[model samples]
Target: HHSSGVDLGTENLYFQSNAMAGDVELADRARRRACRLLRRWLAETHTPVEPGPLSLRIGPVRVSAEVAYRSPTGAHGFGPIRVLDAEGVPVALADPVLLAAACSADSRSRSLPSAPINAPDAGTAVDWVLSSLADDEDDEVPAGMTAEEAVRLLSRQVDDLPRSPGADPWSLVAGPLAAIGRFGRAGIADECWLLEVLAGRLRAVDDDLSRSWLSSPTLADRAVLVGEGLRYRPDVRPVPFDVPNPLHEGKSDVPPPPVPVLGGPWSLRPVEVAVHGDGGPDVALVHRWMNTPHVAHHWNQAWPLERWREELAHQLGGEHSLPCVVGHEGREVAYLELYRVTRDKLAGCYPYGPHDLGVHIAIGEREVLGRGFGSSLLRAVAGALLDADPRCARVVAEPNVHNEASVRAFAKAGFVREREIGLPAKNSALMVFSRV
Candidate 1:
């Protein structure tokens, strides 16, 4: 937790620097530190994100600030700090404040005046990173696509070149490549995959800047000059991807896929969906939730607490479905059951695959209900399910047709409603969600 003057939240009480051209060296260094500190902060302030295969990728990012400080010699106020994504391509918009804190604090403390510093605050940076990282709006990146595959599919090296080399380096691309490097070093995502691709592309464009990655300053210069050049330039953007795109991750040949701990954001709050631990669920809590009138109305399994323990034991004992607990803030908000549809009763109702996964959801805590959190919650859970097991194709859910609330929640979360199917318990509306 030593500040070393670079850590933003701790020692960075204040910062000041005059306007200057954005330097890739400074930005790349700051981005790495900021990402590192932000990851650490999330661990201490919130729960640390469990590391596994990267479900997210750090794409193009832009961070900047606007100010009205026209005076020659007076303290100035930094205005609306912005973290822009060059292309309208929706991806994670990391917080500029944390970005600035990580980069600016050090520049102001050690470097000369006019250190080219302006960006969002640390909190804003964390908000952007956590929320963006958790969200799956970038449909371009399929849930199962590996880091290298994502880059290859997205990279348009030849067209991304600076058609007009005279254009300002900042204008050539949307943001610096340091953000990617930072995320890579922070273990946030596999950013280095993108970096290598971009670096090779940069090296191919010019002789001197071609090998810019050879030294610290030159490498940073390319990260800025060539990295920024990556934004589609009309003549630039609408071109074919230079790298080959193919599937190489966990394919569906394996049945009973791994149930990794999943996480993401729903309505700006971090939501974690985890497999019920080896110790099993809190039987008392499960009993209480099942007994509630709202839940009990549809699900008649309001058995005794002791009975609930055995029930969970039986469910978890087999791989048909791994009952899970959904978390928000510090407490359990809901309970979810993720099962392989091929092995479940639903299998008979529809054409199924070994990789097809199904989910049964129940809102547990009363605090989150009737607030439109259901759809967002559903979206987060489904997104995580698809991302966790690359082999998993469809995340299916069957809710009683009579239950309008659950039915509506499913549609709002992008689940395609299929016709009603007969189940042992109730005639249910089958809703299916896939990356497409």
Candidate 2:
């Protein structure tokens, strides 16, 4: 039903053989992602190829193939085709590759990681790649000798190989996408060998969609690929940070409150900053996080389990502050404190507004540290606070003056460092976030 809208706009692009639109939707998107991954991988790992836009379609392949061939940066690739869904959300076009880079760069601004292919030591990748769905038995990437024979070697891993359009189709390709990304990061001076091997594997997929993607790659997608060169202003003096890559950016509207697992335009991935429930499990997580040395240095609460249990009860029982946990896909990683500023000891320091909100955060997850999760989580939570309670005109934080990471995170999260101020037991930077 979704056409590439070229001359084949009148043709039946998808059969719509499947009942659920969601199922078919996932398949099409996954196909787009795979094609996109292939193109980006080539651009990054191969010397001859550079990153370019891709257009994956089900319509006539002739138009796309000719378009790509004529294009300078690419010969065949997937979209610059951005499809919006019912709610005007660009649901189909979320590129985790650019997202990964942005966040990798974000994290590099914060920290680093490593290992090898397949069972590589991507501990945090569990959250990124949905580790529960991982298959350790995946076939290793091949070093191929022939185009004719390589197909057999790289064929086993395509679990969702061009089959019936099904729900949860992303589960089919997430591993390969993650794997291919890691491989590009690994190396490929001997790029032809590796690329051919991957190409044979994708060929092995031999789905109707893949066939069209390789053959007909769209014009708009080609334009998008070559277009990046223009966007890359080697000489620019507008702002401190780079202009946002339109592909990686999400919707402007932040998700409204009580979204249990929260992610936003700023965040690296989906994270939970929900109210910390008063369970032994909850108490245990915070106790574990607080006792850790890094968190202990920033957060003064390195108390024992029993005391933490009492403190948890106490905080939940109080009217002033709400204690919350930060998590990745179910694993607890950090802790957040949301409070009304007026009732706090901070109220005595500044003439606080009627509903000014305050935040205190401790990033307990070591794996996520140094990876720009700080500003991301802070802004996500802070933005959500503004969304939930409209009365709050300004969101505020008081980060310890000594914690460079903490202070920087707050500053990056739209907080302006007002001045160094003395608190109960610490010297702090009073910071404020407002809608400008």
Candidate 3:
């Protein structure tokens, strides 16, 4: 073994066996690309991730491999990798060169001996298993009392509990819900179902408390509501929801429009426009607008004509986004883009509603600049979005906070400043206008 402790001969053999064994040229290309991709990820994450025991079908042959991560210093990393066959059996072949490339490029360069840590057992299949405690004991039941009395006693006990700092009442309420579930499992159908109905009513109250806390017009009002709700019955628990991924493109629980939106503005006149076309003139106009100092300052980059053409082409073919050129009686004055917030990359940036729309605008021509046109233009576009889709609930914008002109324009256009939010690209003020 060399000083790096990687057997060069073994690695080379592994590479040849896996990457170069196929259509020779095709294998080599795939090996190089995999090496490059893994290397980049290693560099970015600064941590090695075990590559798969992934299997890919190639014609009649199936290829599978288990991969490993090695720190740059030649130390073994986390997780085990194994190549697999169609039957989910482990194969002896492994991608050693890819692992070596990943380890060699590792910036940490940790060096540790590969002993003491037992290599994972082979031939094990992956599957999900759930476990719970065995129920061997019978639940205590008051023979003389009815189910209604039992529930009243439980609720009364919870309501009488003194509120203490650092305690959550909702969790306490879970005890009864759990009991009801367990009672049902224990075959007490009548009492269990009755208690479940009562528990559901409490659950509704718990949900309303949470809503009132969130919807209070002021901070003090929210605090007061939360305090009173907790004091009254701390055991009411609301259902938990997972945090959403902002970049995820899948459909959300938030409803989407039932039908495709047709162009129709909220308030008529002063402005009219159509979806941007993939024409030379339209592309050139967008490019000019993008290159302007005013637009570039907030947009952060001056895109070339080719880029605009590509983007406009994408918009023309996309469902969620609309790119348009605004005109007053017939001359193009500004560039406006609109998109459904539910389908946008910005979906999880704030409290997103089912029918929210996002807006991006730039006043291209100097003649329309500061002519009190921004507000009217924004209102007309927002109106069009809301009117076109009955599901459209709110229109939102994220303009640079320092861009006072845009903020004032949104305000005058009937949008309210929600708050400041940090986006991946920039810090922006989230302004919104709701449908009446």
Candidate 4:
């Protein structure tokens, strides 16, 4: 119920339609001039003629048509005459050809299928046509084509269609709009093709399809047409869904921790910093990270028999167990704990955000001097961390700047100097660095 207001008496013409009758005052124009203008408009409303029994094309930025009925019984005529408008909507009054064109387009859609019609790979073009024309299927009309036919008329292979961000509904039609914008009217068939493509695109993604990708940019429930352009179709595969809670939900057959492969050779896994419980063996290797006289000054206690067992069991069971053993084949090594980082604890540890996590190792033994175990442990820790986060930009460690040995060992492991920050707990400057 929209109308175009045209005051023929005042020569003011504008396209405005709402829920009311359109104003058309044609008393001002002389009969001859009015007739000439009307005929001229009719000639401009030409669109492709489709042989289909029913056809339709209407939308925001495309050509559209509609029909109007006028009483021809000026005191006496065959009841009333129904005429079609060539211009879309109320403008049909000026040129009945607009309505006629609309009817013709409708016919083309319904009757012609294999017609040499031009359709672009844009959604907006089709959107324009569908919005204005009635869905022949919904009307239950015996339109020449079926609903599937109408849809198929607009659809192309999943890949042949242009790929859109698919996140936004508007993106699907941008290509068609651009096509029209660039080539105004010279390419007639091109615009028609664009219209059909747009219509199909709207159908493919409008709150229906979930053929989306893991791409962060896409919106929910959008269709993702794979491949390059029209003529290439790529198969789309599903991606794994996200898990709510990986651990605690249930225990998986966790693989056994890694064993010191080349026994007796005190070295960490090749370069990789951090390894997650899922990566390899669950057996953890423990060793003193730094025997620095200064850093070791904090934990120089006689190993308690029961306490050591309790700690070992906790490391093995309470989630802090390392994947493999790290200490030496000898007993001269003071005290070392090579348990893996608890998934729950390390993953969501306060300082570092929740993510794949790794374990921590320290030496409580003070008797054994420098046996390169500190450096070896550092390398192992780095490997574990890297394994946990393949894209890990770097690995980091904080050591007391006063402990020259710890600093030297970390440097030897390719750790570089970051910033020196004061630690309130130890009252010392903590040197931080990532594996360079």
lDDT of each: 0.48, 0.47, 0.49, 0.33
Instruction: List the candidates' TM-scores in order.
Output: 0.39, 0.38, 0.43, 0.28
Return the candidate ranking by lDDT, descending: 3, 1, 2, 4
**Which segments of candidate 3 are over 4 A away from where they belong?**
1-249, 252-279, 367-370
lDDT score at residue 132, model 1, on the 0-100 scale: 42
**Order of models, best TM-score first:** 3, 1, 2, 4
lDDT by residue (210-237, candidate 1, tens digit) is 3332221211111110111122121112
Model 3, range 1-436, lDDT digits (tens) per residue?
Answer: 5886666687788886796456775444445434433332232222223444434332223434344433221122223333456787766333433333322222112111121111122100010000111223233445465656656665664444343444453333244433443343333434435444544444444554323322321111011011111111212111121122211235656543222232322222112223455446777787888899977887755987777777877765656667777666556767767777767755645557667788888787764544777787788777777876767788899886667789999999999987544343343667999989
List residue ranges in candidate 1 displaced over 4 A.
1-257, 260-262, 265-281, 367-370
Alpha-carbon lDDT of model 1: 0.48
The alpha-carbon lDDT assigned to residue 268 of candidate 4 equals: 39
Each model's Cα RMSD? 23.5, 23.9, 18.8, 26.9
What residue pairs clash in candidate 3, if any at all?
65-83, 66-82, 66-83, 73-109, 169-234, 173-235, 264-384, 265-384, 266-383, 266-384
Task: Give the higher-TM-score candidate: 1 or 3.
Answer: 3
Q: lDDT score, residue 290, model 4?
A: 34
- On TM-score, the candidate that comes out on top is 3
Backbone clashes, each candidate: 10, 11, 10, 70
